[PDB]
Amino acid sequence: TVSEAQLARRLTKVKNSRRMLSNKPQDFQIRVRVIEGRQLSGNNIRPVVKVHVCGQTHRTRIKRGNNPFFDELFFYNVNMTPSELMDEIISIRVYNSHSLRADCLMGEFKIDVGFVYDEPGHAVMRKWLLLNDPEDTSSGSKGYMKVSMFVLGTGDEPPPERRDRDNDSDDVESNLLLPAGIALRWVTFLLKIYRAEDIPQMDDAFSQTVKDKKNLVDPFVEVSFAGKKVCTNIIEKNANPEWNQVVNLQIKFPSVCEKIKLTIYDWDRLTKNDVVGTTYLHLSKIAASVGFVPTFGPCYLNLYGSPREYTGFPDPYDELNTGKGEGVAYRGRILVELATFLEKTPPDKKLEPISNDDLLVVEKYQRRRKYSLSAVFHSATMLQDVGEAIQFEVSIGNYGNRFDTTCKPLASTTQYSRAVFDGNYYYYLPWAHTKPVVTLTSYWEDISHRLDAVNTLLAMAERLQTNIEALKSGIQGKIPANQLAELWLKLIDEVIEDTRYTLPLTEGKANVTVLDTQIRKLRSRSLSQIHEAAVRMRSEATDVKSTLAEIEDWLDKLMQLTEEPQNSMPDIIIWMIRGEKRLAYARIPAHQVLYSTSGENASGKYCGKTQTIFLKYPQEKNNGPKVPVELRVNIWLGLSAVEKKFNSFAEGTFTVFAEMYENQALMFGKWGTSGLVGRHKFSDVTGKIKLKREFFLPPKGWEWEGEWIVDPEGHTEFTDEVYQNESRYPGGDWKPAEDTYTDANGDKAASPSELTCPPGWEWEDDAWSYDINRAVDEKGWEYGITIPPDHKPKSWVAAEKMYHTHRRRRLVRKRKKDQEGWEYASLIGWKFHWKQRSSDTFRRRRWRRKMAPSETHGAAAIFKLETPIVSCNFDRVYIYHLRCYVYQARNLLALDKDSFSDPYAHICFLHRSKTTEIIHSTLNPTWDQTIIFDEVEIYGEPQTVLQNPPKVIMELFDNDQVGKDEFLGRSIFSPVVKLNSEMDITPKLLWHPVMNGDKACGDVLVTAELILRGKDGSNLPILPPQRAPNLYMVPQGIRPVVQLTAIEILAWGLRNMKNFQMASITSPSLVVECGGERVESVVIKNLKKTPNFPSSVLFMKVFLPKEELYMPPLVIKVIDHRQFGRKPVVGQCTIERLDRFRCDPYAEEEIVDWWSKFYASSGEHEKCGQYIQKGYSKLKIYNCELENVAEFEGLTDFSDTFKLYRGKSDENEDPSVVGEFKGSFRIYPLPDDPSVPAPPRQFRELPDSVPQECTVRIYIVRGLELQPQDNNGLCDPYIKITLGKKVIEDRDHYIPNTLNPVFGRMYELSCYLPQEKDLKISVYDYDTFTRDEKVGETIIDLENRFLSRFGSHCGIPEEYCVSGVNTWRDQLRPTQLLQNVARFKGFPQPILSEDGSRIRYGGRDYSLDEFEANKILHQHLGAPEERLALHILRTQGLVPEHVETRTLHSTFQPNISQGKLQMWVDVFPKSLGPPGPPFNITPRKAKKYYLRVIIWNTKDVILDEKSITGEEMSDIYVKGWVPGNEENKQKTDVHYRSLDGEGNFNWRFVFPFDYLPAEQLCIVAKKEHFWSIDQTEFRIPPRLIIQIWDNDKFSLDDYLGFLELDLRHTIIPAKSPEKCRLDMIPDLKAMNPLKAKTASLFEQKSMKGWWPCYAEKDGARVMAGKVEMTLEILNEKEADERPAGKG
Ligand SMILES: CCCCCC(=O)OC[C@H](COP(=O)(O)OC[C@H](N)C(=O)O)OC(=O)CCCCC
Ligand SMILES: CCCCCC(=O)OC[C@H](COP(=O)(O)OC[C@H](N)C(=O)O)OC(=O)CCCCC
Ligand SMILES: [Ca+2]
Ligand SMILES: [Ca+2]
Ligand SMILES: [Ca+2]
Ligand SMILES: [Ca+2]
Ligand SMILES: [Ca+2]
Ligand SMILES: [Ca+2]
Ligand SMILES: [Ca+2]
Ligand SMILES: [Ca+2]
Ligand SMILES: [Ca+2]
Ligand SMILES: [Ca+2]
């Protein structure tokens, strides 16, 4: 089917155009411009064009004739998401207009913005449209419309144009926007919506608790597609609704929408409709190109969003329910199906019931299979908070939810564990050898045929990506070619052995959809293509450095194949619950842990493997300053039928304890079993339920271990912590509490003067101190309030208030190197602690028995227990030894007010933490420190550690002397694991990003290694050398190998230095620090007087790493030497990309003006003119800036520009720019032998650094497509130029009513470079009664023009002319410029011959005849030696004579072009002399013409319109006018009472019109109303419209027919009225017409003959008559030679 192929190709174009687009809403600008209408329907119409994009509307003025010309440009400014703006439509509707009535619709065209995003150049150019009625399209077309539309986002620019103006006008049938084969075809999607389930409670339960807790929701689905929203029925009071309703989505092929948005809403009668959840169906992801149409389902789509717990208060995370944010809890799921029906249009029912046979079909997609989940919680580290206990809930879907009411108790949560200080900074849950185990059972559809293929292709691409990074490491480490070829052959053999995999069959399985079969066919085709390309490349390719592009193509193809839109299995969400409140979440995709019987590859990556997940706060997109917890968890999901296969995945021995409590009390100082306050002797934990010993029995698959007995349950450095607490009444005075010293238990503890060291320990510091590195006041106290029954606080603030009742202070100190089982409390059922205090009068003891699984069931008996609680016991501990080589950091955030930081780092690994040193006043620290954790206890087998190592976390902090230490970022990386000695290789330092928030805020050069510690640590390597006590250096193998290099700094000068401490930078100096070395420039005496350093060359010999990867950043500082010896830092920059700085140190009436040259160099106007044939000069028009031309290197080849910064940053971003340092660097290694001489310096050709007075001539040519600044869509632009303090405002010489203003004006200035180097060219809008609006601005570094090698101070023309128009405008002759660029390059002085026939340059002799080969020379050329010097001056990349096109920028839209400005700048330094004659770029005037017609005869004119005289009769007379010259409407005399349609007139006409011969376009100026401020300038092609009128004695004048003749392309007439046939005019509407014989009236100055006249009746041409006339065009000279006559 042809149409399904077109839909598939369009959707795959949308797919591969939307695969890099982000989701952050940014700014977009849409330019839609109409040009010209052709063959518009109707009779004597007055057409306008109205464009409606996204609510903003624009409209062109009233034009005339059926072939109108508008040339109107319209703008639209929106800020949408770059995956959402492709839902909008552009509507072009054409309206006939009447003088006294409303408009009438004639044409209508819709188009998606996606296709005009999709086009090359991000825009379509000069394309034609099909105008038709929006639903009466069977009546035929009603005209054509030439438009152009543009899409530009951040950094995008519109494309330029060529000479295609005569290619697009008559040849419409090749320049359509859409061809005829696509047509106006409807596309229908039948989105059947069957049912939903597990919808959360979204209504109040107060109504139902007075008159069920599960069904308090009234859901319906709102389906948003292409702007339209269709709402299904409301199912009142049903958490499992059943709609069974098709939604007939509709589009057309010109407007293809991609994103379907399903949104379940709770219907509320009074309040707003709450949002349950949102899913998306991506049509580009469920369709492909044989290919297939969009298909989906019947498959459940899981919703995610806010937590399911209902609160009547407004929901704080309700933005997650709208689809923004990733969603933290399961919100239910909805069963949908999607089909595509093509070329059939459904009826007006948007919503129909699902047919019953589809309801019996869908039952096989709802089959439930039992699933078993097990989670072994290994470690919960990096906790920031110790107050109250922490548990973890595992839930998949709604199964395992702790807060949901349920019939039986569930084992979905771990026990409440209190955190334990690790001795340095963090906390960890003390799980040790007894890990918590969570087991829950669920029921989902067995969609294993999808997830098997997904997991196997994911394992394929993971192996391929591992081999890809292996080859990348091989080519970056410069490995020998044999090992690289071996790694490449291993990659290719692994790809060959992988992609012979056969996908799971679609037969015999109930849940196979149509999309499953099409996806399997696409996957088989892609895998066979990858396999065959792999065998072909193994058999044919040798260059392994060229095939990796196809290998990355294989990688992103495999990434495309792993996308499963039908993943109905919901994510497993792990929730940390501190107290009774949900705190942090982590979503694991359930396919990643799903077990498959098809093998290890079909199982998930983390199926039965310990994985490290970082929990997140419920609306943070990523981890911020505080990670809540780091979890290592061993999750196994699988079918409950194959749950006996969990025995292979299980490590350790599972264990459940049955418990029994025995209680006593105290009378008269003796304990006894009586006296209990409402509690039993043998009872439960609460004591209220009496339970026997025989009540606990082992279930099936379990057995007893042991017997019923009484069971009451490597740090070299450490830091203790005690807390001091005070209590008071509100408004009272503070006094110490009864628990004056507390701990993590929450009760009284030992005094700081009471606790001592353990044996084998010692004290580092003998005095206690209070911690100031917390959220406290100046004295180290936090404050809080208490509400009963919580008499002790759980949250604290950093400030004191009068209502606070408690306060707390942390104290720290550094450290180095009974059996009866009775637990006592002051009450029964209270908190029993280990030993009896003075107030305890009650006691109890625990008494238990261990249970173990039977050997016949294995470790899978934990799934048969469904309160029995499971814990996994490891019988062996494995000791490890981690070494983190923290070398350095770069580009850290500035978080102090002295524009630096004091960065240190918390190295964390499992339950261990240490801290690096604090490096003061730097953003690029070099810690050079090895952080050693000996004796790290990790449980599980060492192979599981080797496969999935625990992460090392690098939390960087700016140290502050007062207050909190601010957060710099976080680097997470894995250590290389060494389980033995045989694979002992040197670990390699890598730059890991310091992720702060959403972006990287630097990199750290860090690696780590985790060695399995043997017996007495004998296999461990030797300790690194110590540069300080307990301070290890990075050892010699890991540290970068340094060589003596040299850094040359061209300290040229400082620009734009802003004020520091309200005083200007008067006496600055430069400090360049790199590699621990520094150099300092001399102090500038006055920056206002001299802005450049007097000594511009600095030099330092720094030991720098040999590897280009390990190169440290280069730090630039500016120090303002002020009074009293104060030397603050007023600017700093960091330059890490030093690869660019590496260098090898040993390496008729042809009136000629400037505008004729500009047109001939444009290529659009006068391309075939005689100007090029006679061989005059040209110029090079750039479509961008001169700094954006890659040939001239951005004009910073002498010295770059590095922006300096100051102060604290903008919390994620760069700080405020306080200046610029202009300079460059040359880094090159030095010989280590002092006897070998140094390499020569790279800076010897330096110019004079004093300020230079210069005359800058700013030629401004024209503007292109500005932003409108008036309400009528127009502008009145003028030029405002600022240059330091000088300002030229050309407000008196503004150009009225132009979006394309031909300025043509010079603005000559004088300035002192480089104090006034910033040349600002701003275009401003004239307004008479209001303020002026800035259209945009451009910034030109005039010093970059002045100091460049490329000669950008003045472009060099094609030929050296002395007199005339193209005179030499530079100060230096081409010989002087040639010898200057010879002296720049190191070439010798050029040799000038006496006759000028030859010169020498660059070691090559040049000759005049090598460039003057058969070229016609004229009288404007000058000296031959200067001509030859210029003829060789254009060959070495110098800047030619040019018109650059600089894009205007504004704060309206930051990186979006506000317009274009064609112009150029000539900087002339006054030390070289005065410049030459200036160019006259004044715009040329219009040549006046008179178009004279003489109306000879008429023949076969149609009969009269019905008048009062009531006869079959005819009156004929002829009108004629030019569009734009309707004030020149004249007419002939009347031939009354024609009996056969003939009429003699001989009435002469004279048409005054002004013309542009070079632009081939008529020019007219006329105000658009009488009260207009200024005269509108109108640019239209020259066309003559002659129409036949009718006159009556009493009734009005009537219209019969028309003809239209473009004066450049006039229709050659017939020589007789009987030979005056129709269709000489191209019909161009119903069939492909014959080409009209066309000739220009401007050259062929006169012609005579008969022309056809026609009018359209019901879309078909009808002969309205014939006319004989003679057309002649004469200019002013011919009007002077012979008179024009009457008219
Ligand atoms: C006696 C019952 C009167 C009930 C009167 C009534 O109409 O109350 C409506 C409000 C809001 O209820 P919603 O369903 O909009 O909750 C929307 C949801 N919070 C969300 O944002 O997701 O109910 C409550 O505040 C809870 C009951 C308060 C009862 C005082
Ligand atoms: C109510 C009287 C004060 C009104 C002051 C005021 O704000 O006027 C703005 C308007 C439109 O001004 P512009 O055409 O420059 O458009 C500006 C562009 N749309 C923008 O981006 O702002 O002025 C008039 O209508 C002209 C008569 C003014 C008569 C003072
Ligand atoms: Ca509600
Ligand atoms: Ca409701
Ligand atoms: Ca509501
Ligand atoms: Ca700080
Ligand atoms: Ca600091
Ligand atoms: Ca204005
Ligand atoms: Ca204006
Ligand atoms: Ca204004
Ligand atoms: Ca009439
Ligand atoms: Ca008449």
Curated annotation (Swiss-Prot):
Ca(2+) 3 binds at residues 896, 902, 958, 960. It is found in: Cell membrane; Nucleus membrane; Cytoplasmic vesicle membrane. Residues 10-129, 168-289, 867-992, 1023-1147, 1237-1355, 1473-1621 form the C2 domain. Residues 15-110 are annotated as: Necessary for interaction with EHD2. Residues 152-171, 726-755 are annotated as: Disordered. One of its GO terms (cellular component) is cilium. Its cofactor is Ca(2+). Ca(2+) 2 binds at residues 212, 266, 268, 274. Binds Ca(2+). The ions are bound to the C2 1 domain. It is a single-pass type II membrane protein. Ca(2+) 1 binds at residues 212, 218, 266, 268. Residues 1-1687 are cytoplasmic. The modification Phosphoserine is found at residues 3, 526, 1616. Ca(2+) 4 binds at residues 1270, 1276, 1325, 1327. Coiled coil: none annotated. Gene3D superfamilies: C2 domain. Calcium/phospholipid-binding protein that plays a role in the plasmalemma repair mechanism of endothelial cells that permits rapid resealing of membranes disrupted by mechanical stress. Involved in endocytic recycling. Implicated in VEGF signal transduction by regulating the levels of the receptor KDR. The C2 domain 1 associates with lipid membranes in a calcium-dependent manner. This is Myoferlin. The gene is MYOF.
